[PDB]
């Protein structure tokens, strides 16, 4: 019946009106740590900041700030870390967060170069023979393997703590099929990407929360978590028709501002949940 709500919004063309209502009802919490002049160079965009109450704190004593937010969906029993694409000076902060939060999976929803512009920094090794060292941290990153497919790429990474010589396996799920303009016309490849992340066990609570990021960490990143959470709800509820995508999105926006950036991404999220529910 969520399909019925989709057909009626499509018929009246009210996707922009629906999305604008979501923006009007969205939570507004302070972001004072992010707006400190010390953390300007740690933010990719001045209008995309984490809330104080939900920001991920680095275990570094001097400056614990990273543009990342913890999303807790209690009923769906899932947690995500949403962050921006690492900057050239925050690549060590990124992997420090992954280590400290004990994350198993890293979900990347953008290409490094989209339409002749740098949307993200190369924070993982391109060659298996050359490791990456992050000086400000105690971390060593090594590319073990990668499986390249037409819509996404899965890489096996080894994160080593040089202090204790402890190593962890990090799975890197890189979705590469998102168009430079607009949204995918079909959610088939995006859903197959999500189910691939699910099957790896990375979303399971015995691991730390997965790190999901795009360019700013709100747009495509919101669609991944919104779709994943909405699919979990209608599978564990007695009445799957009680799931409201708008309600779930507003609940999500309590933890990070601006999730789902355009009415086009909102329509795509509807299409992914509808097709995903049909796929079960």
């Amino acid at each position: 019946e969520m399909e019925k709500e989709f057909e009626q919004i499509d018929k009246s063309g009210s996707w922009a009106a629906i999305y604008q209502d979501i923006r009007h009802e969205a939570s507004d919490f302070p972001c004072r740590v992010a707006k400190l002049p010390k953390n300007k160079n740690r933010n990719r965009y001045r209008d995309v900041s984490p809330f104080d109450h939900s920001r991920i704190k680095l275990h570094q004593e001097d400056n614990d700030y990273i543009n990342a937010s913890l999303i807790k969906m209690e009923e769906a029993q899932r947690s995500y870390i949403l962050t921006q694409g690492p900057l050239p000076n925050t690549c060590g902060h990124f992997w420090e967060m992954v280590w400290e939060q004990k994350s198993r999976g890293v979900v990347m929803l953008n290409r490094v170069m989209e339409k002749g512009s740098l949307k993200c920094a190369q924070y993982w090794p391109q060659k298996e023979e050359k490791e990456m060292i992050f000086e400000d941290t105690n971390l060593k990153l090594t590319l073990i393997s990668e499986d390249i497919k037409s819509y996404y790429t899965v890489r096996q990474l080894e994160l080593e703590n040089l202090t204790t010589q402890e190593t962890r396996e990090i799975l890197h799920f890189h979705y590469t099929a998102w168009p430079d303009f607009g949204v995918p016309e079909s959610p088939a490849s995006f859903l197959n990407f999500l189910f691939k992340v699910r099957e790896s066990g990375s979303l399971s609570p015995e691991h730390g929360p997965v790190v999901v990021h795009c360019s700013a960490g709100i747009g495509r990143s919101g669609t991944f978590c919104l779709a994943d959470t909405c699919l979990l709800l209608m599978d564990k509820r007695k009445d799957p028709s009680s799931v409201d995508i708008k309600k779930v999105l507003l609940e999500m926006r309590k933890f990070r501002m601006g999730l789902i950036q355009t009415a086009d991404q909102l329509r795509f999220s509807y299409l992914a949940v509808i097709e995903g529910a049909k796929f079960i």
Side-chain angles (χ1 to χ4, degrees), residues 1-3 5-10 12-24 26-39 41-60 63-95 97-114 116-118 120-126 128 131-134 136-164 166-184 186-237 239-245 247-277 279-280:
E1 81 121 2
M2 178 183 292
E3 205 155 3
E5 185 185 53
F6 182 90
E7 302 179 24
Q8 288 308 304
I9 297 179
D10 251 23
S12 67
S14 299
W15 282 111
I18 292 291
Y19 178 69
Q20 279 304 316
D21 297 344
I22 291 177
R23 293 193 60 254
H24 183 264
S27 302
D28 176 39
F29 302 122
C31 313
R32 298 168 188 162
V33 179
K35 301 304 297 182
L36 293 176
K38 179 181 55 178
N39 299 327
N41 65 336
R42 303 191 172 198
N43 298 309
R44 183 173 289 267
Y45 302 103
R46 74 170 296 183
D47 24 86
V48 175
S49 298
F51 295 132
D52 284 331
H53 80 270
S54 64
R55 71 177 187 90
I56 299 291
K57 295 190 180 71
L58 297 177
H59 295 190
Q60 154 68 207
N63 195 344
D64 60 7
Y65 176 78
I66 183 181
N67 195 319
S69 310
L70 177 58
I71 325 291
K72 311 190 213 209
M73 302 304 293
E74 286 297 288
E75 186 188 346
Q77 304 187 16
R78 193 142 281 173
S79 306
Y80 319 86
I81 293 180
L82 265 67
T83 186
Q84 65 186 16
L87 283 165
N89 61 296
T90 65
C91 289
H93 303 156
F94 179 89
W95 289 113
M97 175 183 64
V98 169
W99 184 272
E100 291 166 5
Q101 303 303 317
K102 299 179 174 58
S103 305
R104 176 78 167 99
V106 178
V107 173
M108 180 167 185
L109 300 167
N110 66 274
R111 271 136 74 238
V112 175
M113 182 95 66
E114 286 183 354
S117 59
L118 294 175
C120 172
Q122 188 72 35
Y123 63 93
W124 74 94
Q126 292 178 340
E128 309 166 358
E131 84 266 340
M132 278 187 61
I133 301 295
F134 304 97
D136 48 341
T137 340
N138 260 143
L139 294 177
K140 163 185 163 186
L141 186 59
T142 302
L143 172 61
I144 297 301
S145 65
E146 56 179 5
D147 177 24
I148 302 180
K149 297 183 177 178
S150 66
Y151 300 113
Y152 55 85
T153 290
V154 185
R155 306 181 174 89
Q156 287 179 349
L157 306 168
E158 191 190 81
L159 199 61
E160 176 157 352
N161 176 16
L162 302 175
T163 293
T164 66
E166 180 186 353
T167 62
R168 307 200 187 118
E169 182 179 31
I170 305 296
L171 295 181
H172 194 239
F173 301 93
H174 190 180
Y175 188 70
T176 63
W178 200 283
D180 297 304
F181 298 103
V183 299
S186 167
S189 60
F190 183 74
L191 281 172
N192 285 326
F193 175 80
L194 169 65
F195 299 149
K196 198 77 172 61
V197 176
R198 286 184 168 188
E199 84 175 27
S200 74
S202 299
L203 304 171
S204 186
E206 74 261 21
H207 306 294
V210 296
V211 174
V212 187
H213 75 81
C214 41
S215 194
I218 57 182
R220 304 174 192 172
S221 297
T223 304
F224 177 89
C225 305
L226 179 66
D228 178 43
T229 288
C230 291
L231 291 170
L232 285 171
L233 293 176
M234 41 191 40
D235 180 84
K236 64 154 52 191
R237 280 188 181 184
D239 178 32
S241 71
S242 57
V243 178
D244 191 342
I245 298 183
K247 288 198 193 68
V248 180
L249 176 53
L250 288 177
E251 164 64 20
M252 278 192 160
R253 286 201 165 198
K254 295 176 183 172
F255 302 94
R256 188 168 172 89
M257 66 170 61
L259 301 181
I260 307 301
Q261 281 175 316
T262 64
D264 209 12
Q265 294 176 345
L266 183 65
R267 183 181 188 274
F268 179 76
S269 300
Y270 266 82
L271 276 172
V273 176
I274 288 177
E275 285 211 28
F279 192 86
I280 286 296

